[PDB]
Nucleic acid binder design. Structure first.
Lengths: 185, 123, 702
RNA sequence: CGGCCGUAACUAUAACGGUCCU
RNA sequence: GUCGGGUAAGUUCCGAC
RNA sequence: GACUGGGGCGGUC
RNA sequence: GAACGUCGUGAGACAGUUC
RNA sequence: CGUCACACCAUGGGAGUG
RNA sequence: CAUGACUGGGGUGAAGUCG
């Protein structure tokens, strides 16, 4: 174990935890009226199980409407089963070649129970990156003995892994913040 | 018992429990219709029947049966509850009047016109 | 009852746009016409107007209350007799409602703003209205503004509006210095002494500069006159004068046959010269002696024409022309009686939508007071309180008498503005408003589905479309530009994807349960079928037990409809069971439930939806300069044109615009076509986006 | 006075199963 | 911290988890 | 123990 | 001053918390 | 037969709130 | 008497897991 190979491994690992974080934010069907709402409805296209972007675009003018633009008349429908549902639940209206979407609860309330979950799950993702820092640190301890780095040296190097973690924490916050604009859409 | 045992604690009655939330001692009650369901019957029978939650004028919400060979209610249409529970459908101890308020009524029915929604056919 | 005949009843209208001074003109008209105001008060400014500060103003005026604004001769100039002013419209564009109103009144006064000449709103209504026969005289109002001379106003009436206008009056002064009108038919020139009336009027000079004008306008009167009759045309052509009697005869003839539009002047804003014009309405525009009849056809089929004619002895017939909702006992349905008589507490017939009516209490609404009456006679006008199915345009007749006297029904074209909720709070408020609107007006339009797809709102008259939309967005709130149109769909999903495997082969649940299917989904014709759906067994009982092939298949089918698709079930897709496994000699209910469950988890993932969106036939009628602009509106509204043909003052574009793409269509359309358009929106088809519909809409849009 | 992994009807959780060491 | 409450708005406070 | 871009930790003698 | 978690054989310590 | 998932229904307890 | 974060047990259901 040399610093460079630990870092290369860490960069791989942490990225997977950061990906778990992206997942964790996107994966509660977000704050009902979102783009991330609709990736719980991967739509079957060309016999493939295609991601949301290839069948629609999702714009938002306010937190109470969700406009889902689908270039073709047919396409708007196949997106429509993702605005709708009951865990992605909404009641769409046709306005554009897009649905402008009136909210069924009581000026929304299904958006809340999901948004709290999203932020908690986001932190579970961050915790995962920090646990990866712990594993990286464990390896940093082994590396330290091997290259004869002292306790202070390894703890400074561990702090450096923690700073690298914190870049992904910063990105985690950014990821969350992007989902926040969706929630506020 | 015995006269004595009766003079003390006579024969108690029995508060008749009228299975009906939309009581108010009425033949029927107006509603609003929350939605239109299609729940399944009990174990002995099959086939999905039509029902719907109603927001009775007295607040007392309750699902009413929508008998007839042809539904036509909306998630806002105003119907009139009558009574007569239904077995296969539990909790559904009511039925929406056929041919009243903002509801509709069976179509092409030529037998038992009184019931359902029909009044003297094409002659 | 009545004492004055049909002839000495004058059903006359005022067709006047907003630009002539909507408020001022109506107050002044109620005063002017044969007293519908407090006794006297006709000299000097403000005192004239004491009647309206004390009680009711506006309406439509029955007049002849015999104490002010009369003339000395019977049926000569003003009054001695009944003059009923039923209003006419001349705003925006022509509609069936505009046509309908013009027919209740027997004559009309078209009113123009002097400065504006002929504004857009007046012309569009006029050319279309002329085709369905409407006699009009022109009243150049607002002579306290510019255009307060014949030449400016008259060119606009010919050019913009397409009538033949001609001078027969000369104005004295122009703008603020205007104070008089010269009558070139009675040969007086009049200076009005008050800014309300003109009592203590001074017959005055014609200024030297206007002597010439007056003589030319008199000559223009003679030229116009001569066209009436072949005899007059001979005399004119050589040179020979057409005397007072000749011109008077010609004026009556040409106005009643709508061969001309006489031009008069007088401001109803500075309130001088109006009175002279109103005398001419009484003298020369039609009365019920020229229209005592109303003609229908049977309500049962269209078997025979049936003609009504005035006579108390003849059965009742009346045309309802307006509905108001009085808080007294509800809806008052104003009607003009053509024949017969109706008495309070009678049964009358709604002889066009075939309902029996209970004629309750009948009232005549003066513009100052409410007076309950018990009877109406032939020629009388009144409002009945409480009717079953008689509303605006609807026919009233005796207890029974089938006859179509309504030749344009109360349900009217879908010209809509969209009232849109956005929150559940707004959705709740919407529901209350729609219920309320239906009960007062059954002929409004709404488009709606539950919780969303709601509402596109249409009115039934010029005030009406605005009034209904305003109350919903203002008083009862609404957060605009979200939901507005009803929908309904089916899937048409197709794709050749050989695989999805569902294999369950465990000990769960209960006994050992095994079910395995592999299915190939292959394209089936994108129909309009909501059922779909073709199943082929490539391998039958060897892949799942032959006895059980429907149960397993049914379990997936139900579940698949619930999975990733389009919100509309697997429809117009072909499905091929071609492989699978499991004990083909054993089954249980439980086995098909597990088999279906695993099959469904794999199954949702692979295919390729294709469906439909509603396309609306949007027929837009706008003035012809907007051919550009309708196509422009369509571009901003992803819409297209499929034919565009001229229609009178306007062009009629036959556009296809998706129903789905409206944004409060009338508002957008008006903005892009400069307020001049009208439209109807009817379903054309739901579409797969066909080549012409997709290409054309995109084409307009860029 | 423990861990790692897979898992039921929209997800998320996993009563359940597995497995390593006490 | 999260939910609830009080507030026009409550990194404190009170009730929960 | 010292060296040490204060010293200490680290590292080196 | 005192305490918890954590670090240290320990004196004590913390870019932790707590009165 | 009893947990333990779910989904509804009514109901006891509750910082307190009206 | 109405109501409340959360929470307890009861009842149905469709019947799943575990025995």
């Amino acid at each position: 174990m040399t610093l460079k190979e630990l870092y290369a491994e860490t960069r791989s690992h942490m990225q997977k935890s950061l990906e778990v974080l992206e997942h964790n934010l996107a994966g509660l069907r977000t704050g009902r009226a979102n783009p991330a709402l609709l990736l719980h409805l991967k739509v079957e296209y060309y016999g493939a199980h295609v991601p949301l972007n290839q069948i629609a675009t999702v714009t938002a003018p306010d937190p109470r409407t969700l406009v889902v633009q689908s270039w073709d008349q047919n396409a708007l429908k196949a997106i429509e089963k993702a605005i709708r549902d009951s865990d992605l639940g909404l009641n769409p209206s046709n306005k554009g070649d897009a649905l402008y979407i009136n909210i069924p609860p009581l000026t929304e309330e299904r958006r809340k129970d999901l948004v709290r979950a999203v932020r908690q799950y986001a932190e579970e993702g961050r915790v995962a990156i920090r646990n990866i820092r712990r594993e990286a640190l464990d390896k940093l301890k082994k590396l330290a003995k091997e290259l004869h780095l002292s306790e202070d040296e390894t703890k400074r190097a561990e702090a450096e892994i923690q700073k690298i973690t914190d870049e992904f924490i910063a990105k985690a916050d950014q990821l969350a913040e992007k989902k926040e604009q969706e929630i506020l859409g | 018992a015995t006269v004595n045992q009766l003079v003390r604690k006579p024969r108690a009655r029995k508060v008749a429990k009228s299975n009906v939330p939309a009581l108010e001692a009425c033949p029927q009650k107006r509603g609003v219709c929350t939605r239109v369901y299609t729940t399944t019957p009990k174990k002995p029978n099959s086939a999905l029947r039509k029902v719907c939650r109603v927001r009775l004028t007295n607040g007392f919400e309750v699902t009413s049966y929508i008998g007839g060979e042809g539904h036509n209610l909306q998630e806002h249409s105003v119907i009139l509850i009558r009574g007569g529970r239904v077995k296969d459908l539990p909790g559904v101890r009511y039925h929406t009047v056929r041919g009243a308020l903002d509801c509709s009524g069976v179509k092409d029915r030529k037998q038992a016109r009184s019931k359902y929604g029909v009044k003297r056919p094409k002659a | 009852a009545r004492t004055t005949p049909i002839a000495r009843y004058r059903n006359i209208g005022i067709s006047a746009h907003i630009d002539a001074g909507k408020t001022t003109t109506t107050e002044r008209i109620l005063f002017y016409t044969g007293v519908n105001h407090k006794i006297g008060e006709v000299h000097d400014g403000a005192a004239t107007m004491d009647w309206m500060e004390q009680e009711q103003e506006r309406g439509i005026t029955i007049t002849s209350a015999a104490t002010t604004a009369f003339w000395s001769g019977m049926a000569k100039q003003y009054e001695p007799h009944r003059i009923n002013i039923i209003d006419t419209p001349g705003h925006v564009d022509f509609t069936i409602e505009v046509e309908r109103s013009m027919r209740v009144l027997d004559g009309a006064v078209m009113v123009y703003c002097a400065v504006g000449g002929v504004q857009p709103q007046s012309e569009t209504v006029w050319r279309q209205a002329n085709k369905y026969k409407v006699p009009r005289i022109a009243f150049v109002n607002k002579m306290d503004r510019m255009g307060a001379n014949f030449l400016k106003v008259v060119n606009q009436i010919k050019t913009r509006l397409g009538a033949n206008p001609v001078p027969l009056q000369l104005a004295i002064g122009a703008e603020e210095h205007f104070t008089g009108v010269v009558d070139l038919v009675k040969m007086k020139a009049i200076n009005w002494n008050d800014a309300d009336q003109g009592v203590t009027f001074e017959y005055e000079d014609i200024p030297a500069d206007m002597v010439e004008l007056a003589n030319e306008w008199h000559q223009n009167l003679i030229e116009s006159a001569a066209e009436a009759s072949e005899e007059l045309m001979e005399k004119y052509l050589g040179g020979e004068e057409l005397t007072e009697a000749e011109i008077k005869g010609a004026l009556r003839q040409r106005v009643l046959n709508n061969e001309i539009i006489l031009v008069t002047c007088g401001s109803a804003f500075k309130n001088k010269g109006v009175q002279a014009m109103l005398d001419a309405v009484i003298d020369y525009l039609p009365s019920p002696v020229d229209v005592p009849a109303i003609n229908g056809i049977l309500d049962d089929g269209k078997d025979t024409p049936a003609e009504r004619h005035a006579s108390d002895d003849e059965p009742f017939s009346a045309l309802a022309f307006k509905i108001a909702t009085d808080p007294f006992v509800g809806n008052l349905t104003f009607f003009r009686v053509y024949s017969g008589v109706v008495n309070s507490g009678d049964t009358v017939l709604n002889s066009v939508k075939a309902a029996r009516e209970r004629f309750g209490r009948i009232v005549q609404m003066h513009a100052n007071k409410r007076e309950e009456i018990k009877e109406v006679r032939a020629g009388d006008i009144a409002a009945a309180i409480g009717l079953k199915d008689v509303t605006t345009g609807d026919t009233l007749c005796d207890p029974d008498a089938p006859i179509i006297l309504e030749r344009m029904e109360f349900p009217e074209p879908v010209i809509s503005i969209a009232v849109e909720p956005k929150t559940k709070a707004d959705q709740e408020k919407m529901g209350l408003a729609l219920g309320r609107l239906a009960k007062e007006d059954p002929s409004f339009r709404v488009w709606t589905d539950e919780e969303s797809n709601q509402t596109i709102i249409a009115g039934m008259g010029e005030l009406h479309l605005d009034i209904i939309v305003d109350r919903m967005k203002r008083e009862f709130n609404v957060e605009a530009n979200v939901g507005k149109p009803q929908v309904a769909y089916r899937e048409t999903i197709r794709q050749k994807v050989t695989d999805v495997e569902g294999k369950h082969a465990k000990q769960s649940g209960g006994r050992g349960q095994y079910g395995h299917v592999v299915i190939d989904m292959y394209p089936l014709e994108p129909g309009s079928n909501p059922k779909g759906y073709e199943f082929i067994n490539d391998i039958k009982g060897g892949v799942i037990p032959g006895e059980y092939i429907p149960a397993v298949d049914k379990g997936i089918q139900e579940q698949l409809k619930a999975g990733p698709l389009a919100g509309y079930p697997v429809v117009d897709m072909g499905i091929r069971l071609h492989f699978g496994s499991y004990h083909d000699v054993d089954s249980s209910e439980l086995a098909f439930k597990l088999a279906a469950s695993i099959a469904f988890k794999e199954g949702f993932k692979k295919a390729k939806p294709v469906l439909l969106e509603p396309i609306m036939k949007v027929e837009v009628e706008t003035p012809e300069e907007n051919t550009g602009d309708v196509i422009g509106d369509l571009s901003r509204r992803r819409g297209m044109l499929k034919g565009q043909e001229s229609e009178v003052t306007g062009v009629k574009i036959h556009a296809e615009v998706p129903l789905s793409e409206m944004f409060g269509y009338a508002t957008q359309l008006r903005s892009l076509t400069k307020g001049r358009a009208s439209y109807t929106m009817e379903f054309l088809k739901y579409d797969e986006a066909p080549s012409n519909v997709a290409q054309a809409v995109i084409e307009a849009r860029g």
